Amino acid sequence: SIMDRSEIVARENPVITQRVTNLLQTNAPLLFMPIDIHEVRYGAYTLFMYGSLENGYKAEVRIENIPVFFDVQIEFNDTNQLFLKSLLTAENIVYERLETLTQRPVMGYREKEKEFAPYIRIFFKSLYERRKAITYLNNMGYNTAADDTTCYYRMVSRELKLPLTSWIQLQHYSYEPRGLVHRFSVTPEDLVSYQNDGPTDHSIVMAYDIETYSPVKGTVPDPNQANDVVFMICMRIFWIHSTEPLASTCITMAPCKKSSEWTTILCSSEKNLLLSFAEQFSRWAPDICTGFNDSRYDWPFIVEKSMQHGILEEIFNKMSLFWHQKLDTILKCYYVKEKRVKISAEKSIISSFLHTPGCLPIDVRNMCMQLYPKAEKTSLKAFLENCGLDSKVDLPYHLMWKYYETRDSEKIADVAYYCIIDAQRCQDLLVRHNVIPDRREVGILSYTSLYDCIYYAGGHKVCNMLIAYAIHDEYGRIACSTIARGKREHGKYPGAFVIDPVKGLEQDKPTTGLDFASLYPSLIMAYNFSPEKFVASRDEANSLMAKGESLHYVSFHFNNRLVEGWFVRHNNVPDKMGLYPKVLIDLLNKRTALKQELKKLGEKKECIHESHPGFKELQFRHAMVDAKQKALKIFMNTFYGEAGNNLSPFFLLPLAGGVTSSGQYNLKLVYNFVINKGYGIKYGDTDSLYITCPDSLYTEVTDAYLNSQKTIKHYEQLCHEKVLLSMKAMSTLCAEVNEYLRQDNGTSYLRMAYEEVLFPVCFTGKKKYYGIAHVNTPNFNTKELFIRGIDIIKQGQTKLTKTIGTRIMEESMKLRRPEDHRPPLIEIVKTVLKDAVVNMKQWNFEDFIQTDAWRPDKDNKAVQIFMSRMHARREQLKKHGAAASQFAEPEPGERFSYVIVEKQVSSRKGDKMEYVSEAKAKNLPIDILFYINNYVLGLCARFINENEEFQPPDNVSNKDEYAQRRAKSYLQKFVQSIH
DNA sequence: GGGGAAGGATCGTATG
DNA sequence: CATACGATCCTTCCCCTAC
């Protein structure tokens, strides 16, 4: 009584399935979407594309006769061809046939006459022979183009204009049915990409969750232990873009009540449990598998228990659409172990999953941390609360273990419900964050598969997109390589132009940030930074300068040596434009067009009410345009990172050095121009300059304030006029700066932008500033603060960090008369901290709660001391004949909530720990001083750790974490003094 | 890896 | 005036996630 994928799809959309089968009967062209891409390495190369048709059917399509090739840059001739033939034959490499052609080298500028270079293309039958031949030819010093060595489906995506994450049209195929999967065989000239907006996708995502058991109480279950078992396997199948359950199931050992919302299958053993899981997987055939933290606890434990019982081979072969495979191949090539997934520049994750062909695995946790690289709490509850979704049901783990042990068939239904809701929340997060469409659009722009957009970094994607744009081209097939060459020199680039910030509470004149709009791509656009326009020899550069060519000179100090170079300018002619400027200009034009389209779609969505039967497609188009513009942004902001990476094939030290030096030169020019115009400089950071208007421009506006009744409302009037005059003057300042830049570099791709006005403002140090933000009209009554640098977004251990950090900032940023004896930042911190300490009643009890875990095997000192004190108290109460029921020990692994209390005359954390129930029973003081000292002063020290008094002497090595110690000690002394 | 709690001697310094 | 306090350098898990 189990319903397979075909019947479910037929039940969902009958008319679409009828149209699909009518098209299939007549062998008409149809539509396909790939999700997981698998390729065979040995033997004849056939590329398998797994995915879904437009109704929801599972389709495998194999692309036969893909041309497998790579290019070598030698002079084409009979003698050279014979020599290369002998070289390939001597090291027993099987070749198919050879071709000759002409291509443009990517490194080094050449004139028009010598623009093309001869290349010989080697055709091959298998990928293994190609990899051996490419290694042999690279070891002999020959140059190699179209030289991908890791994955070859990127070659198929690049050469054929065939995105592997977008729709593909099947024409002239060969259908063959084998049940739940439909097999097509296609010739690569019979495949085309679907240009316009495709229909609604109908892929299937299976969200699964596992609940386990361990005889050793209070310890996380471990796969290696023999007694450790899985007992709940709960999984649901959803659409790619919906949260409604298509079909749900629970696979169990312990008896459970029949439920009308999901199907429960009873298994008498763990082996039968795993086989039932595999059978339901095979019957449903997910396009995508998912689950929260499934690559670190779920899949390893499943595969370890499958290996222990010796059923891994049969489970894999039932769950995979590929042919039969043996256990060694499954453990070697398909079960990945210790794979590294990158979040940011300093964070990496270890993941392990079973990549069965026909289904692509995604961790919800990996996407959640990729979208929020600075997230501090990475639990499911934390992400659910941040994203504003329904939280998990309150079921403790020890209660689950106890109810499993009692074998009570009635209430294991609650355990199943908890596991199914945990499965639901994963795809709830996936739909709410719109991860899969964003990855699809990244793949469309990058010509990669979805697997690469999920588990690989974006730098390789940018490199792939650049190669894809280069190889097609409009002016003659620019050829480029992929593997890196030359010595990977390591060093530090020259430092940025440091501008000393004028620290303090600036509330006499407004400041405003002039920002370079996409500075590094703009300099790449303007100065024609491309590898094929680079000249290294000085004599060649002089010869080009002789024949009426415009060049840009770059010179920088790297590793104590002078690196110099010349770049050929395009002179505002698209024919002479380089590869990087062409790619960036195309991406910027696309971004502008989609910005216009998104504005029109948003206006239409605001116009059209939700009751009309057209809101779904409008929201769906809005989702596509938002995803597309986000992908365009993430590729455009990554060009400099890929250009500066040493491992990149396109890496060129003059290119990165010239980009940095040109940014330096333009920032210096803007700085000098602004100073010579009379304006002031407050802060400068790479691409941003904060400008303060001259005093004289305000004079008349100030004069009416001095001759008035001199009241408060007069001062808000003064501030209002101040902001208006600042905006009006500095818009013209920005226009003149743009005109000067255009007159300097000769192009119009480098412009400045007027982001918002900051008044009053506070710069506390390097990359640490805040203030009131004004966008078009002044509003000083707002509670929204423009913040950068200060880590106010930190829940930490208490909510007092939030409250006091906000209160300091708000007390600093209000308007004050020039006759109210303006206190500096340190005095404001002093008075707000005194107000916090003295006025105890302003706080509530719930902000003083902390949570901890009681694990009687770990050497957690404070928890050990608290539990020892509680045990001593319980023994003392029992000796006195007192029923210490609410003093009882927690169950092992059970989280408990505590507070800190005053202890009259140790100072350790443990002796002040008390239970929440005990604290509310006795109404004890909550010892605000300890909380303030250990949690609030960390943030409060960030505000005054650049003052003159808190400075190191000259004879000290460490300069960063050496003044905050004195700041914290000074605040400690002040807090202890105020009593 | 980055922050949280806990443990020890001696110089730096002070006082009845 | 020689003891007693105290803070800094430095060292060791523990929490983090999933049960």
PDB file of N, CA, C and O in Angstrom, chain A residues 250-289:
ATOM      1  N   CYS A 250       7.453   7.177   8.298  1.00  0.00           N
ATOM      2  CA  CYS A 250       8.239   6.930   9.499  1.00  0.00           C
ATOM      3  C   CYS A 250       8.615   5.459   9.524  1.00  0.00           C
ATOM      4  O   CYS A 250       7.755   4.596   9.332  1.00  0.00           O
ATOM      5  N   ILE A 251       9.891   5.171   9.753  1.00  0.00           N
ATOM      6  CA  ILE A 251      10.404   3.812   9.734  1.00  0.00           C
ATOM      7  C   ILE A 251      10.993   3.563  11.117  1.00  0.00           C
ATOM      8  O   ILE A 251      11.860   4.324  11.571  1.00  0.00           O
ATOM      9  N   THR A 252      10.524   2.512  11.787  1.00  0.00           N
ATOM     10  CA  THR A 252      10.687   2.372  13.229  1.00  0.00           C
ATOM     11  C   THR A 252      11.001   0.941  13.638  1.00  0.00           C
ATOM     12  O   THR A 252      10.800  -0.010  12.880  1.00  0.00           O
ATOM     13  N   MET A 253      11.505   0.811  14.868  1.00  0.00           N
ATOM     14  CA  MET A 253      11.587  -0.474  15.558  1.00  0.00           C
ATOM     15  C   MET A 253      10.453  -0.638  16.563  1.00  0.00           C
ATOM     16  O   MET A 253       9.696  -1.612  16.504  1.00  0.00           O
ATOM     17  N   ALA A 254      10.343   0.301  17.499  1.00  0.00           N
ATOM     18  CA  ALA A 254       9.365   0.192  18.566  1.00  0.00           C
ATOM     19  C   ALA A 254       7.950   0.317  18.007  1.00  0.00           C
ATOM     20  O   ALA A 254       7.726   1.020  17.019  1.00  0.00           O
ATOM     21  N   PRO A 255       6.987  -0.387  18.602  1.00  0.00           N
ATOM     22  CA  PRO A 255       5.601  -0.286  18.131  1.00  0.00           C
ATOM     23  C   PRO A 255       5.063   1.130  18.267  1.00  0.00           C
ATOM     24  O   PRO A 255       5.373   1.844  19.221  1.00  0.00           O
ATOM     25  N   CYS A 256       4.261   1.535  17.288  1.00  0.00           N
ATOM     26  CA  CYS A 256       3.680   2.867  17.259  1.00  0.00           C
ATOM     27  C   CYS A 256       2.238   2.795  16.785  1.00  0.00           C
ATOM     28  O   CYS A 256       1.846   1.872  16.067  1.00  0.00           O
ATOM     29  N   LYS A 257       1.454   3.784  17.201  1.00  0.00           N
ATOM     30  CA  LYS A 257       0.072   3.893  16.765  1.00  0.00           C
ATOM     31  C   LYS A 257       0.008   4.265  15.288  1.00  0.00           C
ATOM     32  O   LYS A 257       0.827   5.039  14.783  1.00  0.00           O
ATOM     33  N   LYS A 258      -0.966   3.686  14.590  1.00  0.00           N
ATOM     34  CA  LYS A 258      -1.255   4.095  13.224  1.00  0.00           C
ATOM     35  C   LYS A 258      -1.678   5.558  13.197  1.00  0.00           C
ATOM     36  O   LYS A 258      -2.502   5.998  14.002  1.00  0.00           O
ATOM     37  N   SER A 259      -1.111   6.317  12.264  1.00  0.00           N
ATOM     38  CA  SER A 259      -1.386   7.742  12.155  1.00  0.00           C
ATOM     39  C   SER A 259      -1.954   8.048  10.779  1.00  0.00           C
ATOM     40  O   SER A 259      -1.569   7.427   9.786  1.00  0.00           O
ATOM     41  N   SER A 260      -2.875   9.007  10.730  1.00  0.00           N
ATOM     42  CA  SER A 260      -3.529   9.376   9.485  1.00  0.00           C
ATOM     43  C   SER A 260      -2.778  10.447   8.709  1.00  0.00           C
ATOM     44  O   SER A 260      -3.169  10.758   7.579  1.00  0.00           O
ATOM     45  N   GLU A 261      -1.719  11.021   9.278  1.00  0.00           N
ATOM     46  CA  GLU A 261      -0.948  12.045   8.590  1.00  0.00           C
ATOM     47  C   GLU A 261       0.360  11.528   8.008  1.00  0.00           C
ATOM     48  O   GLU A 261       0.982  12.235   7.208  1.00  0.00           O
ATOM     49  N   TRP A 262       0.788  10.327   8.384  1.00  0.00           N
ATOM     50  CA  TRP A 262       1.997   9.737   7.826  1.00  0.00           C
ATOM     51  C   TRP A 262       1.907   8.224   7.952  1.00  0.00           C
ATOM     52  O   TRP A 262       1.099   7.695   8.719  1.00  0.00           O
ATOM     53  N   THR A 263       2.748   7.536   7.187  1.00  0.00           N
ATOM     54  CA  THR A 263       2.758   6.079   7.144  1.00  0.00           C
ATOM     55  C   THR A 263       3.892   5.545   8.006  1.00  0.00           C
ATOM     56  O   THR A 263       5.042   5.969   7.858  1.00  0.00           O
ATOM     57  N   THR A 264       3.571   4.614   8.899  1.00  0.00           N
ATOM     58  CA  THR A 264       4.554   4.006   9.782  1.00  0.00           C
ATOM     59  C   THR A 264       4.749   2.549   9.396  1.00  0.00           C
ATOM     60  O   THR A 264       3.779   1.792   9.302  1.00  0.00           O
ATOM     61  N   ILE A 265       6.001   2.161   9.173  1.00  0.00           N
ATOM     62  CA  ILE A 265       6.363   0.793   8.829  1.00  0.00           C
ATOM     63  C   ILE A 265       7.206   0.225   9.960  1.00  0.00           C
ATOM     64  O   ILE A 265       8.223   0.815  10.341  1.00  0.00           O
ATOM     65  N   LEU A 266       6.786  -0.919  10.489  1.00  0.00           N
ATOM     66  CA  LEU A 266       7.453  -1.561  11.612  1.00  0.00           C
ATOM     67  C   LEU A 266       8.543  -2.490  11.099  1.00  0.00           C
ATOM     68  O   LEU A 266       8.314  -3.269  10.169  1.00  0.00           O
ATOM     69  N   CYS A 267       9.722  -2.403  11.706  1.00  0.00           N
ATOM     70  CA  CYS A 267      10.839  -3.279  11.391  1.00  0.00           C
ATOM     71  C   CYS A 267      11.322  -3.955  12.667  1.00  0.00           C
ATOM     72  O   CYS A 267      11.404  -3.322  13.723  1.00  0.00           O
ATOM     73  N   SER A 268      11.639  -5.242  12.564  1.00  0.00           N
ATOM     74  CA  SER A 268      12.022  -6.040  13.721  1.00  0.00           C
ATOM     75  C   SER A 268      13.515  -5.999  14.016  1.00  0.00           C
ATOM     76  O   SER A 268      13.943  -6.556  15.031  1.00  0.00           O
ATOM     77  N   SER A 269      14.313  -5.358  13.167  1.00  0.00           N
ATOM     78  CA  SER A 269      15.754  -5.311  13.368  1.00  0.00           C
ATOM     79  C   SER A 269      16.314  -4.077  12.680  1.00  0.00           C
ATOM     80  O   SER A 269      15.641  -3.433  11.871  1.00  0.00           O
ATOM     81  N   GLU A 270      17.561  -3.749  13.024  1.00  0.00           N
ATOM     82  CA  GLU A 270      18.215  -2.592  12.419  1.00  0.00           C
ATOM     83  C   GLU A 270      18.486  -2.817  10.938  1.00  0.00           C
ATOM     84  O   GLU A 270      18.393  -1.880  10.134  1.00  0.00           O
ATOM     85  N   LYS A 271      18.838  -4.049  10.565  1.00  0.00           N
ATOM     86  CA  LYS A 271      19.031  -4.366   9.155  1.00  0.00           C
ATOM     87  C   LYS A 271      17.738  -4.181   8.375  1.00  0.00           C
ATOM     88  O   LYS A 271      17.742  -3.601   7.282  1.00  0.00           O
ATOM     89  N   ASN A 272      16.617  -4.640   8.935  1.00  0.00           N
ATOM     90  CA  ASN A 272      15.328  -4.446   8.283  1.00  0.00           C
ATOM     91  C   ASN A 272      14.952  -2.971   8.240  1.00  0.00           C
ATOM     92  O   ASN A 272      14.323  -2.512   7.280  1.00  0.00           O
ATOM     93  N   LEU A 273      15.338  -2.216   9.269  1.00  0.00           N
ATOM     94  CA  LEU A 273      15.121  -0.772   9.286  1.00  0.00           C
ATOM     95  C   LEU A 273      15.830  -0.099   8.116  1.00  0.00           C
ATOM     96  O   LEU A 273      15.228   0.685   7.366  1.00  0.00           O
ATOM     97  N   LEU A 274      17.112  -0.420   7.932  1.00  0.00           N
ATOM     98  CA  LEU A 274      17.882   0.173   6.844  1.00  0.00           C
ATOM     99  C   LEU A 274      17.367  -0.277   5.481  1.00  0.00           C
ATOM    100  O   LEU A 274      17.338   0.516   4.530  1.00  0.00           O
ATOM    101  N   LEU A 275      16.958  -1.543   5.360  1.00  0.00           N
ATOM    102  CA  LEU A 275      16.423  -2.014   4.087  1.00  0.00           C
ATOM    103  C   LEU A 275      15.094  -1.348   3.759  1.00  0.00           C
ATOM    104  O   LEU A 275      14.815  -1.059   2.592  1.00  0.00           O
ATOM    105  N   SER A 276      14.258  -1.102   4.769  1.00  0.00           N
ATOM    106  CA  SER A 276      13.015  -0.378   4.531  1.00  0.00           C
ATOM    107  C   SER A 276      13.294   1.055   4.099  1.00  0.00           C
ATOM    108  O   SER A 276      12.609   1.591   3.216  1.00  0.00           O
ATOM    109  N   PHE A 277      14.305   1.686   4.704  1.00  0.00           N
ATOM    110  CA  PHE A 277      14.704   3.026   4.283  1.00  0.00           C
ATOM    111  C   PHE A 277      15.152   3.031   2.826  1.00  0.00           C
ATOM    112  O   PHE A 277      14.739   3.893   2.037  1.00  0.00           O
ATOM    113  N   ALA A 278      15.977   2.053   2.446  1.00  0.00           N
ATOM    114  CA  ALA A 278      16.453   1.970   1.069  1.00  0.00           C
ATOM    115  C   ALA A 278      15.313   1.692   0.098  1.00  0.00           C
ATOM    116  O   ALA A 278      15.288   2.234  -1.013  1.00  0.00           O
ATOM    117  N   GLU A 279      14.359   0.848   0.497  1.00  0.00           N
ATOM    118  CA  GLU A 279      13.240   0.521  -0.380  1.00  0.00           C
ATOM    119  C   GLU A 279      12.337   1.726  -0.604  1.00  0.00           C
ATOM    120  O   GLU A 279      11.902   1.983  -1.735  1.00  0.00           O
ATOM    121  N   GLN A 280      12.048   2.482   0.457  1.00  0.00           N
ATOM    122  CA  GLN A 280      11.242   3.689   0.296  1.00  0.00           C
ATOM    123  C   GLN A 280      11.979   4.741  -0.522  1.00  0.00           C
ATOM    124  O   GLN A 280      11.358   5.470  -1.307  1.00  0.00           O
ATOM    125  N   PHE A 281      13.300   4.831  -0.354  1.00  0.00           N
ATOM    126  CA  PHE A 281      14.109   5.706  -1.197  1.00  0.00           C
ATOM    127  C   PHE A 281      13.999   5.322  -2.665  1.00  0.00           C
ATOM    128  O   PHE A 281      13.833   6.184  -3.534  1.00  0.00           O
ATOM    129  N   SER A 282      14.113   4.026  -2.960  1.00  0.00           N
ATOM    130  CA  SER A 282      14.054   3.571  -4.344  1.00  0.00           C
ATOM    131  C   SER A 282      12.676   3.803  -4.941  1.00  0.00           C
ATOM    132  O   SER A 282      12.552   4.127  -6.127  1.00  0.00           O
ATOM    133  N   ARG A 283      11.629   3.636  -4.136  1.00  0.00           N
ATOM    134  CA  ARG A 283      10.279   3.831  -4.651  1.00  0.00           C
ATOM    135  C   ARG A 283       9.976   5.307  -4.883  1.00  0.00           C
ATOM    136  O   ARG A 283       9.313   5.661  -5.865  1.00  0.00           O
ATOM    137  N   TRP A 284      10.451   6.187  -3.998  1.00  0.00           N
ATOM    138  CA  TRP A 284      10.194   7.616  -4.168  1.00  0.00           C
ATOM    139  C   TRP A 284      11.128   8.266  -5.180  1.00  0.00           C
ATOM    140  O   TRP A 284      10.703   9.167  -5.909  1.00  0.00           O
ATOM    141  N   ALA A 285      12.389   7.833  -5.231  1.00  0.00           N
ATOM    142  CA  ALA A 285      13.461   8.407  -6.046  1.00  0.00           C
ATOM    143  C   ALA A 285      13.593   9.918  -5.868  1.00  0.00           C
ATOM    144  O   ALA A 285      13.162  10.674  -6.749  1.00  0.00           O
ATOM    145  N   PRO A 286      14.140  10.400  -4.749  1.00  0.00           N
ATOM    146  CA  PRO A 286      14.351  11.846  -4.601  1.00  0.00           C
ATOM    147  C   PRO A 286      15.298  12.400  -5.654  1.00  0.00           C
ATOM    148  O   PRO A 286      16.265  11.747  -6.053  1.00  0.00           O
ATOM    149  N   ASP A 287      15.009  13.621  -6.104  1.00  0.00           N
ATOM    150  CA  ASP A 287      15.984  14.376  -6.881  1.00  0.00           C
ATOM    151  C   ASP A 287      17.044  14.992  -5.979  1.00  0.00           C
ATOM    152  O   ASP A 287      18.217  15.073  -6.358  1.00  0.00           O
ATOM    153  N   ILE A 288      16.647  15.441  -4.790  1.00  0.00           N
ATOM    154  CA  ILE A 288      17.552  16.032  -3.813  1.00  0.00           C
ATOM    155  C   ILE A 288      17.288  15.376  -2.465  1.00  0.00           C
ATOM    156  O   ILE A 288      16.134  15.109  -2.119  1.00  0.00           O
ATOM    157  N   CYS A 289      18.352  15.072  -1.726  1.00  0.00           N
ATOM    158  CA  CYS A 289      18.252  14.608  -0.348  1.00  0.00           C
ATOM    159  C   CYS A 289      18.691  15.737   0.567  1.00  0.00           C
ATOM    160  O   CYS A 289      19.601  16.496   0.218  1.00  0.00           O
TER     161      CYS A 289
END
